[PDB]
Amino acid sequence: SMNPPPPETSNPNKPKRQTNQLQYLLRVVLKTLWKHQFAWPFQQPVDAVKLNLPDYYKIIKTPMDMGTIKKRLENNYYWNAQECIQDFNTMFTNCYIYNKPGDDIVLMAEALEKLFLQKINELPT
Ligand SMILES: O=C(Nc1cc(-c2csc(=O)[nH]2)cc(S(=O)(=O)NC2CCCC2)c1)C1CC1
């Protein structure tokens, strides 16, 4: 397929954890970003067949999206907040990598990344 399987949202080999910061990442950070007007391209894995981006996964080797992040948070997949934050950063950087400066999709990611940074500036103790 043009599409690889989506990133795992569970892994029985990997230990689970719940922290105040991870709870906040789901309840506040993810769920607020999700409602932003520019969130829609990032709410699910890129479907290269649907979107006619046959080279997407030829270029992007560590795909990530907020649908996956949401499911990971719901499943207590992450060890800590930093691990989850890394997934958001991978999502943004993928967008900058696959596209180019000034593209509409990049303007969208830029705005979401700013809002994301505002929200993770302070996490609960
Ligand atoms: O996701 C959707 N559409 C969609 C997503 C992308 C995209 C997500 S991550 C990335 O790098 N690109 C891109 C497109 S596009 O080819 O049609 N370009 C558009 C997107 C915004 C500005 C130009 C579409 C719908 C939710 C499933």
Side-chain angles (χ1 to χ4, degrees):
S1 179
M2 209 160 270
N3 291 320
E8 69 185 15
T9 56
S10 64
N11 184 334
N13 291 316
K14 188 176 188 290
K16 291 190 175 186
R17 202 153 79 126
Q18 183 67 292
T19 66
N20 294 333
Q21 295 189 354
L22 284 163
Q23 290 179 302
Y24 180 86
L25 278 171
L26 179 60
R27 183 184 64 86
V28 178
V29 182
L30 186 282
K31 285 180 181 183
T32 308
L33 280 175
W34 193 274
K35 298 171 187 301
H36 194 279
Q37 65 168 334
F38 294 160
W40 63 268
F42 307 100
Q43 292 172 335
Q44 60 286 307
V46 169
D47 182 335
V49 182
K50 175 81 165 76
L51 296 178
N52 316 320
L53 305 172
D55 56 355
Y56 187 79
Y57 294 104
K58 301 187 185 304
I59 293 173
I60 296 300
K61 299 310 180 184
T62 309
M64 188 52 56
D65 64 279
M66 296 202 293
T68 297
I69 293 165
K70 183 174 180 296
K71 292 177 184 180
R72 286 179 172 192
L73 286 164
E74 291 174 336
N75 292 339
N76 305 310
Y77 174 90
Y78 296 115
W79 186 255
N80 64 19
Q82 182 47 242
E83 189 183 351
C84 174
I85 288 166
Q86 180 55 247
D87 280 351
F88 277 98
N89 284 324
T90 292
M91 179 183 76
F92 294 129
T93 57
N94 286 347
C95 184
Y96 308 140
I97 288 166
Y98 181 70
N99 302 285
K100 59 193 291 196
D103 280 349
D104 277 356
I105 189 65
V106 167
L107 297 175
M108 294 176 88
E110 286 165 355
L112 289 174
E113 184 183 359
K114 283 181 191 172
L115 187 58
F116 171 71
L117 284 177
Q118 286 174 31
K119 293 183 187 311
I120 68 160
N121 188 268
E122 295 191 337
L123 305 171
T125 59

